[PDB]
Amino acid sequence: FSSRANKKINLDFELKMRRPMGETRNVSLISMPPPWRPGEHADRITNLKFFKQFDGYVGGQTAWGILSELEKGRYPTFSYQDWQSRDQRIEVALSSVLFQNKYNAFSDCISNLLKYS
Amino acid sequence: MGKRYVATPQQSQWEMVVNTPLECQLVHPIPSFGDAVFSSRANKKINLDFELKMRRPMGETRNVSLISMPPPWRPGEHADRITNLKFFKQFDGYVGGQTAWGILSELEKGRYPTFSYQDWQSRDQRIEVALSSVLFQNKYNAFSDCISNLLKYS
Amino acid sequence: YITFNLLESDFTTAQRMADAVNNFLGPQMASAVDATSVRVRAPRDVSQRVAFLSAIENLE
Amino acid sequence: QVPEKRQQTLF
Amino acid sequence: QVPEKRQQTLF
Amino acid sequence: QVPEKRQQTLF
Amino acid sequence: YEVTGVATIVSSEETARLHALEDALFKAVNFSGADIGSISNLMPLLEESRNEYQFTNHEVRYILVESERKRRGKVEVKIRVDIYPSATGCHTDQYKKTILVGNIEVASPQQAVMGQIYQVGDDFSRVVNRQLDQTSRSFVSVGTTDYSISSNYPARTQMIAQDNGAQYIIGGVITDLTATVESQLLQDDIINRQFALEMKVFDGKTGHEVFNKAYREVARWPFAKTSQVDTRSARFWASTYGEMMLRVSRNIMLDLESELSCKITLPEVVAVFGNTVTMDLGRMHGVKEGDKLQLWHTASFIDQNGLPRNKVSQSEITLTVSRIYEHEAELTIDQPNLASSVQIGDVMNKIL
Amino acid sequence: YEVTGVATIVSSEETARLHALEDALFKAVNFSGADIGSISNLMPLLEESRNEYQFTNHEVRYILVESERKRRGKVEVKIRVDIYPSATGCHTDQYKKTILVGNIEVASPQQAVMGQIYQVGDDFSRVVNRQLDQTSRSFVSVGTTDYSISSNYPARTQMIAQDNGAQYIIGGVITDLTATVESQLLQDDIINRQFALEMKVFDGKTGHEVFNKAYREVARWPFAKTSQVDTRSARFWASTYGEMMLRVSRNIMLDLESELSCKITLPEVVAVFGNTVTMDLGRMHGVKEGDKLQLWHTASFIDQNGLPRNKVSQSEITLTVSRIYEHEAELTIDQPNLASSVQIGDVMNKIL
Amino acid sequence: CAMLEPIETDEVT
Amino acid sequence: CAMLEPIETDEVT
Amino acid sequence: CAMLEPIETDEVT
Asked: Which residues belong to the signal peptide in this entry (chain A) (predicted)?
């Protein structure tokens, strides 16, 4: 998650992969509950597109929504068919463990950002 | 279960930031959200600003509901609706006139002034921001002492 | 409500403990009913009452 | 004339 | 007229 | 009409 | 309607005929669908043995008794009545009330020596529990309890009601089980045994005593003086004494219907999960989806003298039923900004 | 249809004729393929001894009794009835419910002294288990258990149901086994023995009590006063008391059909292997391939007062049956991206 | 009309 | 007029 | 029609 000094609210989320994206695929972003939360259902967040040889990018309100779903203790899950994995469906989740303190530090730094670029 | 930003009794603190005959300032840090600032300045007329300063600035202009909610340790008490404000995009929330004095009054009675609104950074979900009345009375006395010692001219 | 029983019964200690809770939380929160007991209004939820009692029992 | 059962009451 | 057995209910 | 013995089943 | 009333003569033909008429009227009202709460006020005006009865402001207008027979030593009465089942009333739009049957005790164990009927209180509280469960219209029985409920300890009453999930607790004392002997030279002795009882109903929300009534009836004791009678057996409850005690239980149920049925039912908040709260009443209590409920903030205090008191703060919160289970229900708060002021123990009432 | 009803007279010809009519009607409905759940509501309207019966909103319209005989001391009734087997209903599209027969106990061992029938509870729970297994339409019996199920411990009920894989647990208490003696100078003594029983069914998913009923019947005790009767033997169950107890068991089964049959069956998730989950119900429960099921997230909590509560979160997950075994089944999740939110214990219901 | 006379479950006996 | 004679609950017996 | 009267397995006897 990257925020930069600017006059407008900006946040970029980049899923950087060791093995680059094989092909452009439709990706599904869901807010899956962790295992230690029985009885809670998953919320469909949105549908993205991850492009070839590029890191996954989510921006606008959806990146803030990912941060919010992490604040509630949930797992943002990107599901898509991996080219390096014989075109089979794979999931990538962001853990919410040890997120609160670093989210407070991130909010403080965002507070202390220059209002001009 | 939605998002509710309030200082727990162990976390609540009020501070007199500016104490001069030209300005008085009382600050309540809302953990994980920001600050609530009461500012009064030397003038010929009564003036008070309440500013809800957010770490993450307001994403969109929203209608906000100001209510005097009872704390959890006050069963059998109903909530008093105070007013409806409008919080503007990328600006700190502002309450002024008699409503800021009303917020101070509702804090003086052991209640929680609660602002409820839909948060843009939160997938447009409803969130609450409450001001804690714990450890408030001593700092309210200091704030009123400062107000009494303000220059009566600008 | 929850009730605190003083180990050493005294009217002044009972009233001072009532004032300590009222100053911390707010007006009309604790009341001394005799030289030993002080009644403090508490949340109905058991989890919130434990969290509430945690802050109150550490008052000086 | 028969007495009427108690009417609706709150609390 | 016979009473009808309980209808379909969930939980 | 006689009931028919169980049909072929796997596992 | 075509109804039959059966009642055994104990000491007066008038009493047996009146009991048979009451039985026939109760069966007619139960079949007609009319409320059984109104029956308990009709009996006083039935003391006279007139062939024709005229009533005003009731679901029954005229009563005409056509056949009276004393076959097999018990009066049989056949009547025709006109019952008008009202679709309205203060008792049809309310949820069912959960009632806990408390401990019923024999004040003097000396009186229970004949027949050794010492567990008569427990085996009669069982009958009262089953009568309230499977015969009443506006009551649900949540079982029996072994604790004694007193007016001196409202806090204990509240705690026991919370533990059992009961809105009201009903308990009594059996005050008379003595018998007298009537002797004739031609025949054998006749032992007429007494059964007096004082029932008391306490409100579990505040510990108040909301109902108090006394019952006394007499019936023949057909068993031998030295014979031991088991109060769980059919030998006891099929005898004349057993029929009298069953009639007493029915009168208890009818009095509870007469008094508590039109009290507004107040389901309690069980749990709050954000904007959704849980109700202790469910499908089996009459809850239907789409019902609108009004929230009341509950604050009941013991005053300076130790007497229970009630105080409800009115709320601007309205709830609607979202999902219904057999024993509970889920409600959604229509005012999300006020949802933080809902605590466990707040009561609700259905908006009519 | 052509049916015969056999029932022994105990104390009233009306009761024996009614029992024979009930037996004939039960056989006719079983042969006709009609649901046996609806029979239990027809009996109350059969109290009258009319030669012709008229009913509305039922699979049987008119009942005409043509022959009534009292051969060999028991009433035989021959009737002709018209049964309309409905292809629809809330009970035909549901999977079979697994039921565990709990411990049935004798409350007073004193009453079982005559004949020393102390294991009557166990040998009667065996009969109830076999009746539910091989006579019911919508139930599967998973055996008996030696543990006692109470409403005070929902957690124990849930644990025992999980251990035995039972959706419901049924247990009772035998409350009356006493007998009376009827003496005639011409003949020998007649001993009429009582059999009262209170059955209670608990939901294994949440520990709630979903069913509660009481039974009481009387039958002759043909054996000697000092003779010992074995409750596992055919001497006990072929006697009049045994026939009465078998009829009581049949009534238990019919009441369970009347109450629980149209409850929506909720198979549970047994194991999750990636995108494929396992269901505790299989071919023997009525599962067919290609069935579509809807997943519910289960969350049942004990509230602050220790009372069980239910809460289900609705899910956007739909499953279809891929492979079927005799006792289990495999389901494929139609939404692979939501497959990670399925945990063990979630329930499903068949989409109609 | 004509009320029925069907019996019900016994309360204790 | 004509007063009724219906009995009431006994005070002790 | 004419319902059959074939017996089944005994429940206990």
From this structure: none
Those chains having 3 or more beta-carbon pairs within 8 angstroms of chain B are A, C, G
Beta-sheet strands, E only, within G145-208: 168-176, 179-182, 190-203
Beta-bridged to residue H251, according to DSSP, are none
| Residue B74 touches chain G, beta carbons under 8 Å | no
Instruction: State the smallest CA–CA distance between residue H114 and chain E in angstroms.
Output: 40
Q: Is the dihedral of CA G131, G135, G140, G142 positive or negative?
A: positive
> Per the CB < 8 Å rule, is B2 touching G274?
yes
Tokens read off for C20:
């300590």
Residue I13 contacts G where some CB pair is shorter than 8 Å: yes
Q: What residues in J contact G45, CB-CB < 8 Å?
A: 4, 6
Q: Are G35 and G49 in contact (CB under 8 A)?
A: no
Cβ-proximal residues to H47 (8 Å cutoff; 6+ apart), any chain: H18, I4, I5, I6, I7
Which residues of G have a CB under 8 Å from any CB of C? Answer: 343-345
Q: What's the rounded Cα separation, in Å, for the pair G22 and G40?
A: 10
Neighbours of chain D (3+ CB pairs under 8 A): G
Angle at the Cα of G64 from the Cα atoms of G59 and G70, rounded to 5 degrees: 125
Residues facing residue G333 across a β-bridge: G319
CB contact under 8 A, I3 and G31: yes
Nearest CB neighbour to J4, from listed G47, G196, G216 = G47
Phi, psi of C8 (to 5 degrees): -115, 110
| Single-letter amino acid, residue H206 | T
CB A13 within 8 A of CB A57: yes
Residues near H184 by beta carbon (within 8 Å), at least 6 away in sequence = H190
Taking the CA of residue B142 as centre, how many other CA atoms within 13 Å lie in the half-sphere pointing to its CB?
Answer: 17
Pairing mode of beta strands G292-298, G312-324? antiparallel
Instruction: Inspect the interface and report whether the beta carbons of G232 and H312 lie closer than 8 Å.
Output: no
Cβ contact, residue pair J9, G215, below 8 Å? yes
SS3 content of chain D, % helix, strand, coil (to 5): 0, 10, 90
The amino acid that residue H317 corresponds to is I
Which residues from chain G sit within 8 angstroms of residue E11, using beta carbons? 323, 325-326
Collect all residues of chain I within an 8 Å Cβ-Cβ radius of residue H47. 4-7
- Partners of G326 on chain E (C-beta within 8 Å) are 9, 11
Q: Which residues contact H179 (CB under 8 A, 6 or more apart)?
A: H114, H191, H192, H193, H194, H221
Write out C9-57 in H/E/C secondary structure. Answer: CCHHHHHHHHHHHHHHCCCCCEEECCCCEEEECCCCCHHHHHHHHHHHC
| Angle in degrees, 0-180, between the axes of helices B98-108 and B137-148, rounded to the nearest 10 | 140
How far, CA to CA in Å, does C55 sit from each of B10, B135, G76, G344? 6, 12, 73, 21
Contact residues for C22 (Cβ-Cβ < 8 A; gap 6+): C28, C29, C30
- Within an 8 Å CB–CB cutoff, is residue K6 touching chain H? no
Question: How far apart are alpha carbons D10 and C60 in whole angstroms?
Answer: 45
Reported structure resolution in angstroms: 3.2
CB A33 within 8 A of CB A7: no
Which of H275, H338, H348 to mutate to probe the A interface, most A CBs <10 Å? H338
Would the CB atoms of K13 and H242 count as touching at under 8 Å?
yes
Under 8 Å between Cβ of B133 and B26? no
Distance CA G352, CA G350 (A): 6
Beta-carbon contacts of residue G185 (< 8 Å; ≥ 6 apart)? none
Q: What is the sign, positive or negative, of the torsion defined by CA atoms of G22, G23, G29, G30?
A: positive
**Cβ within 8 Å, pair G273-B81:** no
